[PDB]
Amino acid sequence: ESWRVPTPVQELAAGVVEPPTQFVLQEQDRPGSGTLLFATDMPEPIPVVDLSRLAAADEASKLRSALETWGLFLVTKHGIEASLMDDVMAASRDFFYQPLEAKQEYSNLIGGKRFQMEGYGNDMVKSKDQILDWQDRLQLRVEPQDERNLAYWPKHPDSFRDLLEKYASKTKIVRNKVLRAMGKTLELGEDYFISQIGDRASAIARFNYYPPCPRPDLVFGIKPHSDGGAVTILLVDKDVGGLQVQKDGVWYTVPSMPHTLLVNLGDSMEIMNNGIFKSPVHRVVTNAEKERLSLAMFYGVEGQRVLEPALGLLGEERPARYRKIMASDYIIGLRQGIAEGQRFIETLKI
Ligand SMILES: O=C(O)CCC(=O)C(=O)O
Ligand SMILES: [Co+2]
C-alpha cells in the first residue's frame, strides 16, 4: 500500500524536530546504541595510499595492509582534478536543490508507484515495518554504455551528463590501478581482476543526499551494509563527516583528508580473492547542522562471470573459503529479504 511509495526524506525532513516514526531505530540498533557516542577514532596508521606511487614497494605494502585490516583506504594523488570533483558534486547539489516535482521527472518509481533501481528517489521499501534510511539518492547505470537509459539522467544543470561521464572515466582509471596492484600483491598477475570483471563490467553512479536530522542518534543516513560489486570509488563533498566502518564488531570513523577519494572492496571481490581481503561493512550517520552529499561509483563484475576463489590462491593448505556463483545471481540474491543481523556473503562461505 502507501508505505511502498516513500516521499523523499529531503521533503519529510524539512522543519521537523522529531524524526518521523518510520526512520527510528530500535534502541539497541542505534548509532551509540542509545547514547550520543556513535563511533571510535580509527587507530593509526590510518589506511592511506598514494596512487601515483603505487608501483613502489613501500606503497604496495600500505595498500596490502589497508585491505587486510580495513578492506578500504583513502587515496591521494589519484589523478582527478579538484575542479572536476567540485563540479560533479556541484551538479549533484544543484539537482537536489530543485523542487520536488522537477526531481521526480527522473523518479525511480515507475508511474509514481513501482520501485526500480535507476532514477531519483529511495531504496526499495519491501515491508511496512522496514525502518527507512535518512537519505535520498539518484542512481544511474553508467557502464556498459549500451545499458544506459539517458531518460533518467538530469537535464538540468545541462552539464550534468558531461560531468558524470568525465568523472566516471577518471574513477575507472583509479579502479584499474587499484585492481592491478591487488593482482600483483596476490601474485595472480596484474591483469587478473581486470579480466575477471570483463568487457561488460558494470559501473553504477549513486548520488547520495543526506538531509540534516534533528536526532542523529535515532536513525541511519545509510544503514550498515557492504557493497555487492568488486570495488567502490567514493567522493564525499567537502569531506563532511558521517561515514563509519565496522571491524570486529566495533564502529570506527572513516577519516577525511582534503581532495581524496575512498576506495572500498565489495562482496564480489571478497569471493574472487578467497577472503584474503574482505568486503567492509559501512554506514553513514546523519548530523543536525548540515546536509551531506556523496557520490559512489560502484564497479561490478559482468553478470555471466562465475565468481570463484582465484585458482592461484588455492592449494593443499589453502582451501577454498567461498562457493562459486554467477555474478548476476549474486546480485539477485542481494535483493532478497534477509533475517535481522545476517549478511548474504556469509551464505556463500564454506
Ligand atoms: O555516503 C557515503 O559516504 C557512503 C555511501 C555508500 O556506502 C553507498 O552508497 O553504498
Ligand atoms: Co556503500
Side-chain angles (χ1 to χ4, degrees), residues 120-166:
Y120 165 75
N122 301 92
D123 292 333
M124 186 167 43
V125 187
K126 301 171 177 167
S127 66
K128 191 178 185 307
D129 63 352
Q130 187 177 314
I131 304 304
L132 304 187
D133 289 346
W134 194 273
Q135 75 150 133
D136 307 315
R137 90 290 189 281
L138 166 71
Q139 193 144 332
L140 300 170
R141 191 167 309 269
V142 177
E143 293 176 328
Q145 206 159 14
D146 72 354
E147 291 185 5
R148 298 191 303 185
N149 186 345
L150 291 174
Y152 288 91
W153 289 49
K155 271 67 207 190
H156 309 285
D158 58 5
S159 53
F160 193 102
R161 169 184 173 184
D162 184 61
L163 285 164
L164 179 53
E165 288 177 350
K166 290 206 237 180

Side-chain angles (χ1 to χ4, degrees), residues 206 208 222-223 225-228 232 234 243 264 280 282-283 296 298:
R206 182 181 170 112
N208 295 299
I222 197 170
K223 67 175 84 168
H225 68 279
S226 59
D227 300 338
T232 299
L234 179 74
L243 181 66
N264 66 268
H282 52 283
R283 71 191 190 183
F298 300 128

Side-chain angles (χ1 to χ4, degrees), residues 42 45-51 54 59-76 78 174-175 177-179 181-182 231-234 243 245 254-255 257 260-265 277-278 280:
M42 195 176 269
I46 58 165
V48 178
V49 172
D50 174 347
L51 201 70
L54 194 42
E59 211 58 39
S61 293
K62 286 176 196 167
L63 178 139
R64 168 138 204 156
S65 173
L67 285 183
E68 288 169 353
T69 305
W70 295 107
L72 51 72
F73 51 90
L74 291 69
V75 280
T76 64
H78 44 66
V174 176
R175 178 203 72 182
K177 288 180 181 185
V178 167
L179 288 176
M182 292 178 63
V231 60
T232 299
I233 313 297
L234 179 74
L243 181 66
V245 64
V254 176
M257 290 176 59
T260 58
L261 305 163
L262 180 88
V263 176
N264 66 268
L265 304 186
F277 315 132
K278 284 174 178 69

Side-chain angles (χ1 to χ4, degrees), residues 29 126 223-226 246 251 267 281 330 333-349:
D29 298 325
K126 301 171 177 167
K223 67 175 84 168
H225 68 279
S226 59
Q246 194 183 41
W251 285 96
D267 293 359
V281 177
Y330 189 82
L334 290 183
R335 286 194 228 106
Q336 311 309 310
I338 187 83
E340 153 192 358
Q342 293 300 298
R343 304 183 56 211
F344 190 77
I345 182 68
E346 188 78 21
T347 74
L348 278 289
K349 289 187 179 168

